[PDB]
């Protein structure tokens, strides 16, 4: 029944005042993109930064198994859009937030669906 819970550990480390994971790979882009969360090429809008996906994945970066049966990663090989206000901690952001399965935007940072 024992499983390492890295997500919880990082969240707790952050609240303890720990410095976020660094060296996430920020891309050059137009910043006129769709603003969707996870895309095949950078899609940051004016309020976002785009990052290489693998570098923003807690499991990729910590060299640990991805938390699902077949160990698949939703970020690797893609680009993740992070609100500029949160881009000091891309890994924390991707861990703590969710993508609207209809609009492709981050819940609470672009999703309009619940208006």
């Amino acid at each position: 029944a024992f499983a390492v819970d890295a997500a919880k550990a990082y969240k707790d480390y952050l609240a303890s005042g720990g410095q976020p994971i660094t060296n996430c790979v920020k891309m050059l882009c137009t910043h006129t993109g769709t603003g969707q969360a996870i895309t095949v090429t950078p899609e940051a809008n004016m309020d976002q930064e785009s990052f290489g996906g693998a570098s923003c994945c807690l499991y990729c970066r910590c060299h640990i198994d991805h938390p699902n049966p077949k160990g698949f990663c939703d970020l690797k090989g893609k680009y993740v859009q992070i609100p500029t206000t949160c881009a000091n901690d891309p890994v924390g952001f991707t861990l703590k937030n969710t993508v609207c399965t209809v609009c492709g935007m981050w819940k609470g940072y672009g999703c309009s669906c619940d208006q």
Partner: protein, 298 residues
Amino acid sequence: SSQAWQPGVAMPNLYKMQRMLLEKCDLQNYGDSATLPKGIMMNVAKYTQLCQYLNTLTLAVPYNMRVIHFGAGSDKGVAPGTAVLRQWLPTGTLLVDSDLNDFVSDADSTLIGDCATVHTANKWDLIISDMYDPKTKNVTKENDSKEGFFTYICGFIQQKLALGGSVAIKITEHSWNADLYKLMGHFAWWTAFVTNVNASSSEAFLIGCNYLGKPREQIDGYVMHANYIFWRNTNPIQLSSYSLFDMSKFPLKLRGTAVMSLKEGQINDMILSLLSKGRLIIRENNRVVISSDVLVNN
């Protein structure tokens, strides 16, 4: 320097035609630095400018393009150059990368180990290398042609680069190889390209554009490296990040370049001319299969 708005500067043809003796590299702007956009790594900026320059060449861009990237890791365990290549290349391009040290990547497949352990069944349309051994920066010893990963790279080009394909291989004042310059004469065109963001370094990318599989011109690589250094010594390049701010035309154009299988006997002058224009790739179109040799001991 209207050069400052370009992604970088390519070695002018007249410098390639000289017969200079090798001198120490002494760059006027040594220790100058470009101001990068906020939060952007040198490696992202450098690869972005390399790709912006490659956008100006007659690269073959087939469907299901195959690209391999050597030296793709960093001391932080991520792959910024691979991330730029994946941004640049058409969606669906198969991208493999590799490094001596472990790292996490956006490539479709990654191999960890010395490049000499890497084998591939298939041929490639584009080879990028950032490999570099900092021990070569010994200013107190004679600057001779280096072997090491350069020996592997030369063999890999001759054995696993599709006709029509291209390469960009990092060199520096002390990290260079004469046979690799000689191999540049087996392409329709070649240059040494300096990124504007890193122009304070003797780094360049040796670019071979459209591989022909035979010598089109005979190049003495000892002389040409001397020519390269002479160019760098006499042409200060103004550091610049300007081209990083306009990414609207960055993605590599999907050309749908034809891919054909042909045996050496069918490579006629008409085929050679299509290869030279970036209009043909010659290789098989089977599955891409790669591996890393593992040495077993106690």
